[PDB]
Amino acid sequence: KKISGGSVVEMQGDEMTRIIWELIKEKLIFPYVELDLHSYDLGIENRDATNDQVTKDAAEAIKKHNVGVKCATITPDEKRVEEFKLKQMWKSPNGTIRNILGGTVFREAIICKNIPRLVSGWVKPIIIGHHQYRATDFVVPGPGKVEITYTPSDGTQKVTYLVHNFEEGGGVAMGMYNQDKSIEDFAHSSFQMALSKGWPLYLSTKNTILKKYDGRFKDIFQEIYDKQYKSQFEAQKIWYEHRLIDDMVAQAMKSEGGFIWACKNSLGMMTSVLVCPDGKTVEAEAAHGTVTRHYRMYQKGQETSTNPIASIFAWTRGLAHRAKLDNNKELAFFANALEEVSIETIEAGFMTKDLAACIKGLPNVQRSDYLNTFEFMDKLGENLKIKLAQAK
Amino acid sequence: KKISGGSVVEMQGDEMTRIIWELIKEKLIFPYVELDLHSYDLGIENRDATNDQVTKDAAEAIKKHNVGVKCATITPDEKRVEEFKLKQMWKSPNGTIRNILGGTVFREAIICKNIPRLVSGWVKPIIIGHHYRATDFVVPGPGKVEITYTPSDGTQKVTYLVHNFEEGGGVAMGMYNQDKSIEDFAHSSFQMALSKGWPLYLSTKNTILKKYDGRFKDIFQEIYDKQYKSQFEAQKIWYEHRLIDDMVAQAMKSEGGFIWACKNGDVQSDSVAQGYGSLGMMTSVLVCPDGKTVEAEAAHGTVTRHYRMYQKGQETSTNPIASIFAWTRGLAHRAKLDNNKELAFFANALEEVSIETIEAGFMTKDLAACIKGLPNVQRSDYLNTFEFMDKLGENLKIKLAQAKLLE
Ligand SMILES: NC(=O)c1ccc[n+]([C@@H]2O[C@H](COP(=O)([O-])OP(=O)(O)OC[C@H]3O[C@@H](n4cnc5c(N)ncnc54)[C@H](OP(=O)(O)O)[C@@H]3O)[C@@H](O)[C@H]2O)c1
Numbered sequence: 017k018k019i020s021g022g023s024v025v026e027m028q029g030d031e032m033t034r035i036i037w038e039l040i041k042e043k044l045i046f047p048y049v050e051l052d053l054h055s056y057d058l059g060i061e062n063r064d065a066t067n068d069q070v071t072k073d074a075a076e077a078i079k080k081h082n083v084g085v086k087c088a089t090i091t092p093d094e095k096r097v098e099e100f101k102l103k104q105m106w107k108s109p110n111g112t113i114r115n116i117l118g119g120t121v122f123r124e125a126i127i128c129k130n131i132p133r134l135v136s137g138w139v140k141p142i143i144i145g146h147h148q149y150r151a152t153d154f155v156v157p158g159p160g161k162v163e164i165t166y167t168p169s170d171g172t173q174k175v176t177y178l179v180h181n182f183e184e185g186g187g188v189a190m191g192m193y194n195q196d197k198s199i200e201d202f203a204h205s206s207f208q209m210a211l212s213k214g215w216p217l218y219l220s221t222k223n224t225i226l227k228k229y230d231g232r233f234k235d236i237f238q239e240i241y242d243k244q245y246k247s248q249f250e251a252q253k254i255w256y257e258h259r260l261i262d263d264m265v266a267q268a269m270k271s272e273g274g275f276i277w278a279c280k281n282s283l284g285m286m287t288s289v290l291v292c293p294d295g296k297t298v299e300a301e302a303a304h305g306t307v308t309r310h311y312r313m314y315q316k317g318q319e320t321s322t323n324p325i326a327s328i329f330a331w332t333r334g335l336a337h338r339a340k341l342d343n344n345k346e347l348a349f350f351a352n353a354l355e356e357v358s359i360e361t362i363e364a365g366f367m368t369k370d371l372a373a374c375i376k377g378l379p380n381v382q383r384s385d386y387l388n389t390f391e392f393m394d395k396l397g398e399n400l401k402i403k404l405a406q407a408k
Numbered sequence: 409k410k411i412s413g414g415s416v417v418e419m420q421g422d423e424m425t426r427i428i429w430e431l432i433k434e435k436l437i438f439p440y441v442e443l444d445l446h447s448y449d450l451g452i453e454n455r456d457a458t459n460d461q462v463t464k465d466a467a468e469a470i471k472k473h474n475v476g477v478k479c480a481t482i483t484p485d486e487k488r489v490e491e492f493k494l495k496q497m498w499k500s501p502n503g504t505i506r507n508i509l510g511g512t513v514f515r516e517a518i519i520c521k522n523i524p525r526l527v528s529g530w531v532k533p534i535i536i537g538h539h540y541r542a543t544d545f546v547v548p549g550p551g552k553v554e555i556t557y558t559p560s561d562g563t564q565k566v567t568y569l570v571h572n573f574e575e576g577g578g579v580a581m582g583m584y585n586q587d588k589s590i591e592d593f594a595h596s597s598f599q600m601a602l603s604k605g606w607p608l609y610l611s612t613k614n615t616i617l618k619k620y621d622g623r624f625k626d627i628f629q630e631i632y633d634k635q636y637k638s639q640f641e642a643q644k645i646w647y648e649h650r651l652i653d654d655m656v657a658q659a660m661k662s663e664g665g666f667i668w669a670c671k672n673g674d675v676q677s678d679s680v681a682q683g684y685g686s687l688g689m690m691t692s693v694l695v696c697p698d699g700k701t702v703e704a705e706a707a708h709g710t711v712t713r714h715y716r717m718y719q720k721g722q723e724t725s726t727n728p729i730a731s732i733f734a735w736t737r738g739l740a741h742r743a744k745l746d747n748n749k750e751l752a753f754f755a756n757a758l759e760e761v762s763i764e765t766i767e768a769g770f771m772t773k774d775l776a777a778c779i780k781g782l783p784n785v786q787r788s789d790y791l792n793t794f795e796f797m798d799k800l801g802e803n804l805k806i807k808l809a810q811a812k813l814l815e
């Protein structure tokens with residue numbers, strides 16, 4: 017009798033990540049959880065064959081089922097169009113899914129204490145959140161004034177601001193905007209993420225330079241905090257504070273981690289989760305590529321050692337949310353247990369070649385210092401079997 | 409006999425940096441180089457007594473003599489206005505000098521093998537450059553925001569819709585860039601790449617901002633193909649445009665040794681500036697588009713905290729590296745302008761002595777803290793401000809004796 021997992025939208029991907037993704041399901045997920053699985057093949061050949069229809073259907077399935085877990089995919093370039101003889105240079109599946117779903121992206125680096133970090137003092141993870149893409153830019157052919165005007169719907173408080181009077185020559189100009197609703201959705205997603213993980217939240221802004229534009233972000237976060245989150249933040253002993261981007265960077269340099277950083281906006285050790293405005297829909301993926309170099313080694317029968325942590329944490333993050341929506345304690349436990357096993361295995365000295373190279377330096381790595389992809393996956397599977405057995 | 413260094417504009421500054429600036433001149437520069445020195449005292453008291461006229465004169469002297477070396481100065485605020493009983497809250501000397509000369513600021517680290525950096529694989533520094541002007545306002549309620557271009561030659565006005573706020577309000581802004589500022593940014597970046605002998609990359613988001621960022625990519629490309637391609641090829645270096653996301657990822661896997669000209673989006677640019685263990689290991693060079701005018705300084709402040717201890721007679725341990733490198737990078741540019749081989753060698757030797765002294769285990773407290781962690785540093789792990797300067801002086805004497813073997 018396995019854990020009833022419920023409805024999960026799964027997206028298969030490309031190259032080396034496609035193989036590790038199958039290994040994750042076969043050795044870590046399917047032996048313990050049964051799912052009403054909505055599988056979508058986002059491999060480049062299948063996106064080409066279906067005229068990218070499979071991507072739009074996967075995005076539609078995440079809207080309906082609320083939980084998506086996605087494998088890394090190829091975003092075609094000129095070189096990829098010739099390799100697969102593609103009909104078109106298809107847009108990024110991540111971009112297509114992101115535009116259909118909307119929300120805030122939270123990036124979380126997975127911390128293993130024996131694996132070096134950018135800043136050595138980082139002991140707890142840092143979560144970066146961000147909601148520009150709709151700016152109106154143009155070329156200014158020569159001298160003349162560029163003005164930006166606001167005309168209210170009634171007509172009454174109309175204002176015209178001089179952006180610049182070009183005099184010596186031309187250049188470029190652009191108008192940018194941010195709707196209140198977008199700032200409020202980002203603020204709510206950030207406060208909720210901070211309470212879910214139990215860490216303080218910091219919003220970074222440049223309000224000393226953009227007093228009006230960034231000033232509105234700061235005020236909206238401060239108002240939303242004082243109105244509906246400070247009582248829950250005080251209860252869990254966490255806080256919200258604004259920081260100037262230059263100040264925030266210096267504070268992160270002297271920090272030990274353990275916070276959410278909201279911005280106005282080893283590689284296999286980071287996840288990206290899209291949290292939709294409805295507070296119910298989530299899409300989790302590994303924040304890395306398809307590992308082409310390792311895939312070429314695999315195609316030549318050579319032994320590979322590819323870090324699967326980010327892809328495992330896409331599964332655990334998705335299953336953790338699926339368990340929270342359904343109130344499934346068994347699933348919530350399984351998701352947390354797989355994350356613990358993944359970190360415990362690496363911290364105990366069992367890791368892939370790339371992690372061993374971070375520690376020793378590539379020229380110093382011996383075969384005995386690491387496990388190949390299959391050996392690491394089997395080591396995790398043995399530790400997971402033990403962790404789950406000692407729970408029942 | 410001393411080297412004849414030629415014309416240098418020097419600007420004296422404030423607090424701790426003023427103290428070590430004098431030790432550098434006394435112990436490292438003056439015993440070896442004779443200069444036609446144009447010195448301007450940018451001390452806070454002198455700027456107040458001259459009504460900031462010294463700052464404007466220093467900037468005009470840099471324009472005339474092409475080489476400026478600046479000590480850190482106090483940018484006044486309310487506490488400074490009280491402390492010094494200032495007449496006005498004088499503007500930043502760097503802001504006044506930058507406005508007069510123009511140019512792009514390049515920040516470069518000083519690498520030491522035994523001193524940790526953001527990315528361990530970095531062996532050569534990464535030089536990042538940046539060449540307010542934005543018009544932002546709140547949109548209080550529903551309505552239309554439009555941006556308009558009215559040609560001064562009387563031709564038809566062009567209007568672009570920014571956004572129809574159908575419900576509620578928000579914020580909006582207008583930004584601009586002149587073609588001449590973009591051209592100046594490209595010239596300075598190409599000239600900096602050629603001076604250092606490293607490849608140059610321009611990072612934009614031209615995929616999203618097709619006309620705004622595309623103008624940067626296109627101007628850089630056209631200036632490269634017309635007046636820098638052969639000079640770059642002749643040094644085994646090149647210019648390449650890169651999307652900001654590709655660029656931040658290449659810099660994370662590279663060993664350093666490249667110029668990164670970024671149009672901006674400076675979260676990553678700040679992490680590189682503050683990612684070499686200490687503020688004492690970073691220099692900030694203003695490079696003018698003429699390829700002749702330069703102004704170098706430490707990319708840090710006057711070190712007020714250390715200065716208060718100095719006033720009390722307490723021992724201090726202030727890092728002079730960035731201040732030494734403002735002098736050496738200034739002297740290196742002076743040497744290249746005059747084809748002074750003797751001066752070019754001296755500036756090179758002084759940089760190598762500084763790096764070697766630290767690499768041999770002799771350093772200030774901030775560098776010892778980078779190695780052992782601040783709680784674990786003990787007095788015996790470092791040298792005080794004077795001891796380190798005396799050790800650099802001793803080592804410089806030894807290096808110059810070894811160099812006489814070339815002749
Ligand atoms: N998330 C996405 O769907 C996404 C985002 C961007 C790009 N892409 C696509 O990915 C394709 C291929 O990108 P890429 O080959 O540069 O892949 P990548 O995953 O970004 O990795 C580049 C290199 O870094 C190392 N590495 C990265 N992740 C690793 C991991 N998990 N475990 C071990 N080593 C890892 C490997 O080198 P070593 O052997 O030296 O360790 C690898 O060759 C592109 O065509 C692009 O369109 C996908």
Ligand SMILES: NC(=O)c1ccc[n+]([C@@H]2O[C@H](COP(=O)([O-])OP(=O)(O)OC[C@H]3O[C@@H](n4cnc5c(N)ncnc54)[C@H](OP(=O)(O)O)[C@@H]3O)[C@@H](O)[C@H]2O)c1
Nearest residue numbers: 480481482483687688708709710711712713726727728774
């Ligand atoms: N370019 C310029 O002229 C410039 C730029 C910035 C600031 N300033 C001015 O400098 C004054 C003081 O500013 P600030 O204290 O905020 O910044 P700062 O002088 O850069 O000092 C901040 C801290 O950084 C460390 N530090 C910086 N340079 C160091 C060095 N050479 N050796 C050792 N440690 C060093 C010290 O850390 P610990 O305290 O931990 O020892 C120091 O207290 C202000 O009046 C400001 O306006 C001038």
Ligand SMILES: N#Cc1ccnc(N2C(=O)CC[C@H]2C(=O)N(c2cncc(F)c2)[C@H](C(=O)NC2CC(F)(F)C2)c2ccccc2Cl)c1
Nearest residue numbers: 134142144265268279280281656659660675676677679680
């Ligand atoms: N807006 C915004 C915003 C805010 C914060 N982080 C980002 N980021 C990205 O866009 C991806 C990487 C990441 C980032 O810039 N960094 C970072 C990374 N991990 C964890 C953090 F808390 C930050 C920096 C970083 O990676 N610097 C290196 C890349 C480089 F610029 F070449 C040097 C970095 C490194 C070390 C100390 C502080 C900093 Cl901010 C964007």
